[PDB]
Amino acid sequence: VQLLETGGGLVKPGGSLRLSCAASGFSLSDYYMNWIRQAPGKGLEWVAYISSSSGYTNYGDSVKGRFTISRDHAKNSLYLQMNSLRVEDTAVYYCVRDRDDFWSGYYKHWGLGTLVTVSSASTKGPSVFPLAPSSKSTSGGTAALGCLVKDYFPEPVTVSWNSGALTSGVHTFPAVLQSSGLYSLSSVVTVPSSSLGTQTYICNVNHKPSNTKVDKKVEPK
Amino acid sequence: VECDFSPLLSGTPPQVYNFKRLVFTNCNYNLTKLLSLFSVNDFTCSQISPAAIASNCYSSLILDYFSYPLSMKSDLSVSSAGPISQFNYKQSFSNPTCLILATVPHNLTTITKPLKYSYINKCSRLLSDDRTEVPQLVNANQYSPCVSIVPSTVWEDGDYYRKQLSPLEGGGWLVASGSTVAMTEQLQMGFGITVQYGTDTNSVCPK
Amino acid sequence: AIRMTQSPSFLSASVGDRVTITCRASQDINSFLAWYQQRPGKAPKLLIYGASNLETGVPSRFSGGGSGTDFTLTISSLQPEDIATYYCQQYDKLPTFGQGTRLEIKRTVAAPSVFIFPPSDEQLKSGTASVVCLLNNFYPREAKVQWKVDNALQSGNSQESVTEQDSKDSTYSLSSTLTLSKADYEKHKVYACEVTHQGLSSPVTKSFNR
Ligand SMILES: *[C@@H]1O[C@H](CO)[C@@H](O)[C@H](O)[C@H]1NC(C)=O
Ligand SMILES: *[C@@H]1O[C@H](CO)[C@@H](O)[C@H](O)[C@H]1NC(C)=O
Numbered sequence A: 001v002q003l004l005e006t007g008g009g010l011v012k013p014g015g016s017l018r019l020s021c022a023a024s025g026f027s028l029s030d031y032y033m034n035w036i037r038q039a040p041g042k043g044l045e046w047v048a049y050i051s052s053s054s055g056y057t058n059y060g061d062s063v064k065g066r067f068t069i070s071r072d073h074a075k076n077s078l079y080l081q082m083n084s085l086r087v088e089d090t091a092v093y094y095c096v097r098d099r100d101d102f103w104s105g106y107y108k109h110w111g112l113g114t115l116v117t118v119s120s121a122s123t124k125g126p127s128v129f130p131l132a133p134s135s136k137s138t139s140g141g142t143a144a145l146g147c148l149v150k151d152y153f154p155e156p157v158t159v160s161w162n163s164g165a166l167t168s169g170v171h172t173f174p175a176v177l178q179s180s181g182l183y184s185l186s187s188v189v190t191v192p193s194s195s196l197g198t199q200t201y202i203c204n205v206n207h208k209p210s211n212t213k214v215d216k217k218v219e220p221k
Numbered sequence B: 001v002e003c004d005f006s007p008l009l010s011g012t013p014p015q016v017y018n019f020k021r022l023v024f025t026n027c028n029y030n031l032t033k034l035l036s037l038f039s040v041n042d043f044t045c046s047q048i049s050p051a052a053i054a055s056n057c058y059s060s061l062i063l064d065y066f067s068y069p070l071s072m073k074s075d076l077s078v079s080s081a082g083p084i085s086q087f088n089y090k091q092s093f094s095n096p097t098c099l100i101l102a103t104v105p106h107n108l109t110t111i112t113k114p115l116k117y118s119y120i121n122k123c124s125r126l127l128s129d130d131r132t133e134v135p136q137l138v139n140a141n142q143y144s145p146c147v148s149i150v151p152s153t154v155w156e157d158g159d160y161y162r163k164q165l166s167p168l169e170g171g172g173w174l175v176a177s178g179s180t181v182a183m184t185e186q187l188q189m190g191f192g193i194t195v196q197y198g199t200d201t202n203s204v205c206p207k
Numbered sequence C: 001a002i003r004m005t006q007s008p009s010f011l012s013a014s015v016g017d018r019v020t021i022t023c024r025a026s027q028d029i030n031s032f033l034a035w036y037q038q039r040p041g042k043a044p045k046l047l048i049y050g051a052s053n054l055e056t057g058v059p060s061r062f063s064g065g066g067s068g069t070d071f072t073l074t075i076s077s078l079q080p081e082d083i084a085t086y087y088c089q090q091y092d093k094l095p096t097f098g099q100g101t102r103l104e105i106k107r108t109v110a111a112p113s114v115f116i117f118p119p120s121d122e123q124l125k126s127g128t129a130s131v132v133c134l135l136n137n138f139y140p141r142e143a144k145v146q147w148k149v150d151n152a153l154q155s156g157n158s159q160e161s162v163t164e165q166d167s168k169d170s171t172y173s174l175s176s177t178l179t180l181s182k183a184d185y186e187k188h189k190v191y192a193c194e195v196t197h198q199g200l201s202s203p204v205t206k207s208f209n210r
Helices: B031-037 B050-055 B070-075 B083-088 C121-125
Strands: A002-006 A018-024 A033-038 A044-050 A057-059 A067-072 A077-082 A091-097 A114-116 A127-131 A142-152 A158-161 A170-172 A183-192 A201-207 A212-218 B020-024 B039-046 B060-067 B097-103 B117-126 B133-135 B160-164 B173-181 B188-196 C004-007 C010-013 C018-025 C033-038 C045-049 C062-067 C070-076 C085-090 C101-105 C115-117 C128-138 C143-149 C172-181 C190-197 C204-209
Touching (some): A002 A091, A018 A091, A033 A067, A044 A077, A057 A067, A077 A091, A127 A201, A127 A212, A142 A212, A142 C128, A183 A201, A183 C128, A183 C172, B039 B050, B070 B083, C004 C085, C033 C062, C070 C085, C115 C204, C121 C128, C128 C143, C128 C190, C143 C172
Parallel strands (some): C010 C101
Antiparallel strands (some): A002 A018, A044 A057, A067 A077, A091 A114, A127 A142, A158 A201, A201 A212, B039 B097, B097 B188, B117 B133, C033 C045, C062 C070, C085 C101, C143 C190, C190 C204
16 A cells, blocks of 8 residues: 655646646545645645545635546546645645545545645756865764755755665755745764775765756765 | 523534434423524424424423424424434434424524535444344434444535444444435524423423 | 644653643534644654544554543653654544644753864855854754854854754754855854853864864
């Protein structure tokens, strides 16, 4: 059982979007399928269900008549068609399924989600600078280095270290919104400083909304 | 000491299987006034008569009320063998009885409206031996066991409800199904009246 | 809509404690209420369905109770991985959720490891200067970070950012980024961020020369 959301991204206010959820391990139209949203940093809001076998729908007050939840028996997929989209519609959209064949109400199975930004703005790939350590480093102790991912739009950016093979010691900070109107975030990592001159630390930065991939070598000056 | 009928005039009346009970017991009532706030479509009695029901003095007077669609008039009577008296609401056959279907007119505005009419159309217990189904027929003056697993109003018409019971509760499954009838322009309701007389204590006389 | 009122909005307790989150519905919802746990950066996980029913694969230290209009989630014997936001959800009418409760785990005080990073030349060509200060794995969350260029306190030009509390050690991490122009940055010599925090005795200073 997996739920894979897709179809999100930047859209201008007034615009449209067809989010899609590919389901497996079960079959839609046996279950109640739902859509749940979550604004950034805010709490959860139910937006629509398409009932079980026979497909009756219903929606939230804030989205009624604009959003439209659909479904396809083959391709096992679920749709949310969002029209006349508002600034306030900005959220992560979760594709969620009923806990059981019969009417349930709650959900064990959520998808990873998909982000939908709504604003004028404009896409903009990030510049990716290194935050190099110091020769000053605790000789026989911990050192720290990292990426600075400055000036981009929209969210999200994914930063990984050494193709994900390095997780331990990593901190990727929340994005901040600079006065310009763009995002900027950083990612740091602690390492044994014995291993500075001996290991390659490379940060893999990813901005799918603009198709910017930068893998960057961070080393001592 | 006027009987308090106002709580009926305020809010969304429940579905039939969550029938709301008003118990009056030492007061003066003007029933033929209450009914004048509604458009009474049907008014059927049993061991009493609409005239007498409004006239007499009782020890006790029970008024049940709920949203109920006119279209199911045949399902709400003493004689009905339908799913309503089988699983939702059955009144006593040994106390004189009344059954009113009414409509709230544009006139009266303080009665909110559910999203649709629901009713439980099946209600069974699947006993823990894994092979017996025992239909849970509603007793008079009581709720179906299935009130605990069925939402205030059934969401969609086929909705099936299934719940596993603890060995305390008997240990099988409690299973149910609900049906819906589309909401009507003005709200339509059912009222059940149940009176008790004697034995020296008939102090629910009218005003 | 039906309004779920959850309380407290945020609460802090040490490992082993009992915690009780409360939910109130604006009408009877008959044990139709679920509880969810949302760990930093993930989908919610189902904890409790029914009003009291434990979804298999959640530890028995979670317990739900209540019916009608008043419900509690009760984690009792708090553990470091229970750091998350907890939501309640009624499914008696078209679904609505509680506003949220953040659960922080108390922990022995732990001083931040401060690191400072000059801007890289890459960025300096493009004419902007970002000096970053890092505070590392600390508790509690409250930490002051103020910049001092040429020993003059920089004002209104910094910007900090903190992580969600870590699951495997109950600590935080913070990054203030100071920005200038290449024109402005190349004007002064010594850049230093000054870090005061409850875990270290004197404010710590990490400095560098340009
Ligand atoms: C009862 O109420 C009705 C209102 O339609 C009124 O006409 C009638 O006179 C009342 N009777 C008494 C005895 O209060
Ligand atoms: C409201 O209008 C209905 C229409 O049938 C009428 O029967 C009733 O007497 C009116 N109610 C009042 C309080 O005047």
